[PDB]
Design a protein around this nucleic acid. Structure first.
Length: 857
DNA sequence: GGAATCGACATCGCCGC
RNA sequence: GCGGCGAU
DNA sequence: GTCGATTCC
């Protein structure tokens, strides 16, 4: 019984009477009333959303595990904790056999006791019928016993052993299975580790109840949450003493839940141009919903306000220009998808084309994950398709835009161009132009790209399209009769191209086309790092400089690796047989530690290629290094290898993955030297700035931990401030949550480089959008962080625009030095030396980018 | 402070129990 | 919260 | 088994 918002609440967005005479006048009354309607609907959807969610929440007593019940508990828990505290002292200050409950309740940390009570109570109260002080008391007790028993593990027994537990315990979900695991654990630890009994078998259901009972008492005593009134007093089989939820406390939850339900809307497209962003909020959508769009998706409200008066004209221009691009549903594609998707889960997943236990159980767990995946994929596919069909006939739709705290641009509606192949394929720009010679040429480039022929020079791409001219026309004529399109890397996008291509054949170069052709940057991250430090070698690796062939950084890293493999197969360390004595058995065993010579031999034996290095290098700009590579290699190639039959050479998987990681780190750090140094520097800066420098002679704070701030070339300011709570309350098998905060130095240091680059490419994208809109007449854009697109007729200019905008930015700014000025005067007196100098520049000449074909962007 | 050790791949968003 | 999916 | 810093012994 939650306070329905679907009243005069959402009524607020009066799609009939409101100062909307703006819209009306601007795009007519119909559209005006529809936008307001659509906007209104989004809140109703959000509401039902919270509803079905809140439903299951109660349906499993997880009502405590909901934002509707946490506010109260945050104030109810202290009251309770105190009561027990006092009560404990009241018994200690009195001789005579203490109460039954007190005996046990003295072992479980009071905080957990208080909480356990509150949670387990609410779960029972939200039960169909039984709410008897009898069953409830058993429940709380049963829950407390579990805590005292298995909590002992998380305290002494597994002081450190707990590590091999937590991981698998949290992996476990559902109170039931979390108990199964803790029982087996206990059966093992006793079989080896800490020895003792299990003084809980003695806990006859008697003790359980007694415990539960005393708690409920204290609960009703410290706070007023449950009433203990009699039920049918005067009946042999009806006179049942039970518990009821405080009428008031049930109203708060309902009210909190209610209001909440009205702040989570399911954002949809617009039927009229989005509201121009003029300040920190209120942009994008038109209606005045109680959930106003922020121009920046910040963590804390405080964070948002730092933008309130910031002067950044170019930023607003960009966001507004983009947000103004008119889109529409590619009907011809929707037709195809509307049909084949009702025949296949994933229209393109299976088309007819011409160490024991730790291996079988391995595959088993995959089977499960796989099907779970296929189910979540289909949920989303269904949504988008529904969303597509909904707008299939509008002459145009638009998408509002925001930025994350780093400056990257995001479309706001759930259904947007930054989707996936099907989603993108179902979307196309509304205002096209006569294609012309030039545009047609780019049309075909894009086709080659959608088919995966993007690692070859343009003439080979055009060749590819021309040689398949008949296949394409076929897929265009009868898409349901020709599956060739569905077999390409970007199936729907490809199909979209097919149709457009077929139109040109029929209509000629006058054909009005609006398909968005995308130009993607190679490794945006490494690209920018290589530009800001004029790195020629790395820059060349990421297609910054003009070459006749496309450069493949995964492959060049791969080749460097093979050089080391060879080198090690010849020379390199030999195996070594160390002695190992089992901890349990004390059994003496011989195990050989593989040297480089042997490890090299296996990898050569396996065959190392770009596939073994791709992930590692593409995650380099996210902070992963040698350590992080082990995992990737172990499960991206060594694992599947063995599981697929191969991998026989991989005797010691971990030893083999660790070696490879060492080789991939050695190989990248010499291929993209600028990227590695810039990040190391940025990491070093954030480290100092987030440190809490003090004099260890006073323990006095000379400089508190500072956040990291800087400003992108186009004026966007960013503040990195990862905060760490000073709280702590880890529960075992029930919950474990809430209890001031400070800058979290590790996150501060781990997110600086990736966040910097992203801020950088974010500014490049905005600059490009503005430059391309003012210099060239481009006015329709397809944006995806490091991917830029427009209609064919404007493709050649955007191709130019992205390079110009990139060359100009780095010719005019030394983002790293500028960065330095920003924090320099914030480095306490004592840390003015641990700050590495700015890495030296290289010999790259940014101007060459203007002539690099394969660096779209 | 000499180490026990958490941290180790970043951001955004959707769904789910 | 943990798990799955998607975008870069 | 890398690279360091929050934190234990």
């Amino acid at each position: 019984n939650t306070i329905n918002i679907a009243k005069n609440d959402f009524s607020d967005i009066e799609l009939a009477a409101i100062p909307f005479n703006t819209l009306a006048d601007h795009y007519g009354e119909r559209l005006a009333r529809e936008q307001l309607a659509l906007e209104h609907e989004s809140y109703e959807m959000g509401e039902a959303r919270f509803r079905k969610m809140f439903e299951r929440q109660l349906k499993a007593g997880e009502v405590a595990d909901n934002a509707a019940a946490k506010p109260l508990i945050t104030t109810l828990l202290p009251k309770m904790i105190a009561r027990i505290n006092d009560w404990f002292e009241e018994v200690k200050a009195k001789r005579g056999k203490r109460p039954t409950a007190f005996q046990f309740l003295q072992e479980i940390k009071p905080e957990a006791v208080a909480y356990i009570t509150i949670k387990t109570t609410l779960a029972c109260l939200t039960s169909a019928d039984n709410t008897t002080v009898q069953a409830v008391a058993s429940a709380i007790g049963r829950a407390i016993e579990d805590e005292a028993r298995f909590g002992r593990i998380r305290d002494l027994e597994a002081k450190h052993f707990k590590k091999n537990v937590e991981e698998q315990l949290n992996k476990r979900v559902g109170h039931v299975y979390k108990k199964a695991f803790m029982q087996v654990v206990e059966a093992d630890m006793l079989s080896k580790g800490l020895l003792g009994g299990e003084a809980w078998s003695s806990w006859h259901k008697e003790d359980s109840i007694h415990v539960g009972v005393r708690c409920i008492e204290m609960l009703i005593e410290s706070t007023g949450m449950v009433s203990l009134h009699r039920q049918n007093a005067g009946v042999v089989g009806q006179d049942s003493e039970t518990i009821e939820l405080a009428p008031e406390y049930a109203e708060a939850i309902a009210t909190r839940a209610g209001a909440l339900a009205g702040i989570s809307p399911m954002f949809q497209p617009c039927v009229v141009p989005p509201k121009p962003w003029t300040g920190i909020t209120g942009g994008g959508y038109w209606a005045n919903g109680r959930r106003p769009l922020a121009l920046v998706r910040t963590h804390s409200k405080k964070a948002l306000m730092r933008y309130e008066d910031v002067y950044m004209p170019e930023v607003y221009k960009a966001i507004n220009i983009a947000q103004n691009t008119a889109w529409k549903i590619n009907k011809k594609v929707l037709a195809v998808a509307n049909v084949i998707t009702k025949w296949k889960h994933c229209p393109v997943e299976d088309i007819p084309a011409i160490e024991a236990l730790t291996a079988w159980k391995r595959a088993a767990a995959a089977v499960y994950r796989k099907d779970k995946a296929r189910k979540s994929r289909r949920i989303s596919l269904e949504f988008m398709l529904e969303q597509a069909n909904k707008f299939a006939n509008h002459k145009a739709i638009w998408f509002p835009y925001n930025m994350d705290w780093r400056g990257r641009v995001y479309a706001v509606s759930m259904f947007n161009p930054q989707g996936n192949d099907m989603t993108k394929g179902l979307l196309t720009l509304a205002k096209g132009k006569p294609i012309g010679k030039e545009g047609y040429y780019w049309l075909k480039i894009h086709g080659a790209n959608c088919a995966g022929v993007d690692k070859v020079p343009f003439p080979e791409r055009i060749k590819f399209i021309e040689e398949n001219h008949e296949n394409i026309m076929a897929c265009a004529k009868s898409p349901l009769e020709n599956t060739w399109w569905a077999e390409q890397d970007s199936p729907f996008c490809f199909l979209a191209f097919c149709f457009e291509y077929a139109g040109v054949q029929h209509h000629g170069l006058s054909y009005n086309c609006s398909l968005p052709l995308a130009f993607d940057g190679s490794c945006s991250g490494i690209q920018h790092f290589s530009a800001m430090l004029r790195d020629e070698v790395g820059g060349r690796a990421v297609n910054l400089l003009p070459s006749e062939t496309v450069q493949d950084i995964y492959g060049i890293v791969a080749k460097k690796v093979n050089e080391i493999l060879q080198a090690d197969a010849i020379n390199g360390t030999d195996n070594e047989v160390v002695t190992v004595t089992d901890e349990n058995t004390g059994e003496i065993s011989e195990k050989v530690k593989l040297g480089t010579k042997a490890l090299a031999g296996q990898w050569l034996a396996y065959g190392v290629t770009r596939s073994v290095t791709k992930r590692s290098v593409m995650t380099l700009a996210y902070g992963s290094k040698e350590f992080g590579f082990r995992q990737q290699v172990l499960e991206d190639t060594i694992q599947p290898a063995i599981d697929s039959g191969k991998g026989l050479m991989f005797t010691q998987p971990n030893q083999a993955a660790g070696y490879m990681a060492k080789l991939i780190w050695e190989s990248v750090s010499v291929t993209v030297v600028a990227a590695v140094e810039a990040m190391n520097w940025l990491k070093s800066a954030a480290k100092l700035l987030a440190a809490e420098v003090k004099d260890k002679k006073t323990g006095e704070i000379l400089r508190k931990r500072c956040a990291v701030h800087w400003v992108t070339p186009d004026g966007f300011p960013v503040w990195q401030e990862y905060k760490k709570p000073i709280q702590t309350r880890l529960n075992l098998m029930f919950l474990g949550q809430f209890r001031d905060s400070e800058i979290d130095a590790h996150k501060q240091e781990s997110g600086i480089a990736p966040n910097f680059v992203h801020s950088q490419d974010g500014s490049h994208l905005r600059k490009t959008v503005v430059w391309a809109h003012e210099k060239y007449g481009i006015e329709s854009f397809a944006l995806i962080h490091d991917s830029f697109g427009t209609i064919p007729a404007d493709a050649a200019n955007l191709f130019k625009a992205v390079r110009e905008t990139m060359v100009d930015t780095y010719e005019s700014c030394d983002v790293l030095a500028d960065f330095y000025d920003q924090f320099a005067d914030q480095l306490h007196e004592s840390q003015l030396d641990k700050m590495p100098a700015l890495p030296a520049k290289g010999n790259l000449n940014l101007r060459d980018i203007l002539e690099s074909d394969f660096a779209f962007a």
